[PDB]
Amino acid sequence: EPSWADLPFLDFTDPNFSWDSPEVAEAREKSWIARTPLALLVLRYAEADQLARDKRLISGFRGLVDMVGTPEGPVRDFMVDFLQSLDGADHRRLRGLATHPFTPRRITAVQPFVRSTVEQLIDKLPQGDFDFVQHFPHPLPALVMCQLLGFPLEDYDTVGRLSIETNLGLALSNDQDILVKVEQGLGRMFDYLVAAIEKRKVEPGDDLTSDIVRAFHDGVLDDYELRTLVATVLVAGYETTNHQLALAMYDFAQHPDQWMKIKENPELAPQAVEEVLRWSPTLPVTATRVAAEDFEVNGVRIPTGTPVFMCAHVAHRDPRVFADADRFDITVKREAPSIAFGGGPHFCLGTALARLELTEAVAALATRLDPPQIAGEITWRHELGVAGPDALPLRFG
Ligand code: HEM
Ligand SMILES: [Cl-]
Numbered sequence: 001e002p003s004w005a006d007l008p009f010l011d012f013t014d015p016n017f018s019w020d021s022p023e024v025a026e027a028r029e030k031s032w033i034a035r036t037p038l039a040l041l042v043l044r045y046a047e048a049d050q051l052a053r054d055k056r057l058i059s060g061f062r063g064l065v066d067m068v069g070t071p072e073g074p075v076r077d078f079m080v081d082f083l084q085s086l087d088g089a090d091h092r093r094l095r096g097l098a099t100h101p102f103t104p105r106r107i108t109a110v111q112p113f114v115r116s117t118v119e120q121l122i123d124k125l126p127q128g129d130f131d132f133v134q135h136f137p138h139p140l141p142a143l144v145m146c147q148l149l150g151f152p153l154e155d156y157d158t159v160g161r162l163s164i165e166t167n168l169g170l171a172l173s174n175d176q177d178i179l180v181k182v183e184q185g186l187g188r189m190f191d192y193l194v195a196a197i198e199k200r201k202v203e204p205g206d207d208l209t210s211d212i213v214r215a216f217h218d219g220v221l222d223d224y225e226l227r228t229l230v231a232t233v234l235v236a237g238y239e240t241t242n243h244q245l246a247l248a249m250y251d252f253a254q255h256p257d258q259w260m261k262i263k264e265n266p267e268l269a270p271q272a273v274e275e276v277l278r279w280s281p282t283l284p285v286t287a288t289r290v291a292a293e294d295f296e297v298n299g300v301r302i303p304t305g306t307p308v309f310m311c312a313h314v315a316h317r318d319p320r321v322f323a324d325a326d327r328f329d330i331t332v333k334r335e336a337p338s339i340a341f342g343g344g345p346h347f348c349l350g351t352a353l354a355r356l357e358l359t360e361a362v363a364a365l366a367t368r369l370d371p372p373q374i375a376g377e378i379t380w381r382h383e384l385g386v387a388g389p390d391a392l393p394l395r396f397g
Contacts, residue, residue, distance in 0.1 A: 059346060137246040
């Protein structure tokens with residue numbers, strides 16, 4: 001395309017690439033949209049928010065899977081069939097059956113559980129240098145997922161590890177050898193999920209697994225769709241929340257004075273979480289979309305079949321919308337929210353829940369503990385999709 005000529009080039013698949021490099025900022029200043037090998041990347045806030053819900057764009061995940069050349073198999077079947085790849089009737093149908101526990105009223109019903117779990121987890125924290133992921137960021141969303149999906153709470157470590165051993169990001173590749181491990185992980189996770197699904201087929205409960213089992217008994221979805229949807233919810237609910245919590249500690253370790261502001265006034269925790277989501281969103285690229293038809297935004301024309309990815313990280317650093325955009329500050333009253341959860345019909349199902357987990361965690365950690373200090377080498381996730389510490393050695397003073 002000729003209208004693509006003057007667009008800035010960025011390659012976020014480069015192991016040398018950084019989201020906070022000067023060339024990224026320069027690209028955003030120059031253009032609302034950048035060119036990448038995989039997609040057009042929307043860099044500014046206004047456009048990134050609006051395009052995530054624009055009806056001219058459908059889900060881009062299937063396009064991604066094919067574009068990276070993921071070979072045929074159970075892993076590919078999951079990535080092309082799961083909720084995030086679906087649109088229209090099929091999407092509304094599946095998403096609807098899993099909505100109820102995430103309604104911002106049922107979120108309030110789970111709030112006391114989230115609080116006490118956080119409280120318990122803080123009680124069992126080590127006194128010295130310890131990995132925050134293993135001791136908090138992993139257990140918290142794992143226990144929450146178990147409570148939502150109806151798994152025994154004692155299985156929280158197993159259920160978490162199941163998701164860890166099935167890194168879907170690694171499978172967005174044509175490599176056969178790395179794929180074997182992802183496929184092995186997927187199978188093991190299904191083994192656990194299917195067994196729990198069969199239990200709920202006999203005796204349905206109040207949980208989400210039982211909810212979806214009820215829809216199966218009413219013939220709204222088939223058996224394959226059932227277990228995929230249970231798998232979709234677990235992965236989407238565990239990985240992001242885990243990494244985002246670890247990123248929260250990372251931010252506050254860099255800015256220990258603002259942690260103290262929350263200690264003094266715990267009511268600052270809601271907008272503190274928002275600042276964490278703004279400054280370091282666990283998914284730098286939020287919404288992956290493909291053009292369903294020909295159209296034109298700001299002169300740049302997008303033909304049918306063009307992948308368009310919303311870059312939340314860069315859009316959060318947009319000075320057109322955010323005051324002192326590159327400074328981490330919890331106290332500034334923001335006019336616009338973070339868009340760490342995407343938009344449109346695909347908008348994060350667990351937005352309210354994720355915010356509840358982050359808020360309760362930050363409030364209690366800041367009230368009870370001294371500012372976090374990095375105590376060793378941080379292990380970062382290098383794959384496409386979820387970003388953040390896989391292991392975070394820290395101390396609370
Ligand atoms: C802070 C952590 C989280 C972040 C940053 C996050 C972000 C996102 C984003 C950006 C999307 C893509 C939306 C789009 O295409 O516009 C998404 C989808 C989704 N999220 Fe989350 N999420 C988080 C936690 C959770 C939790 C706790 C759950 C609950 C299980 C959850 C469930 C889902 C589901 C089921 C989808 C697919 C929905 C669909 O395709 O319609 N997420 N999330
Ligand atoms: Cl439709």
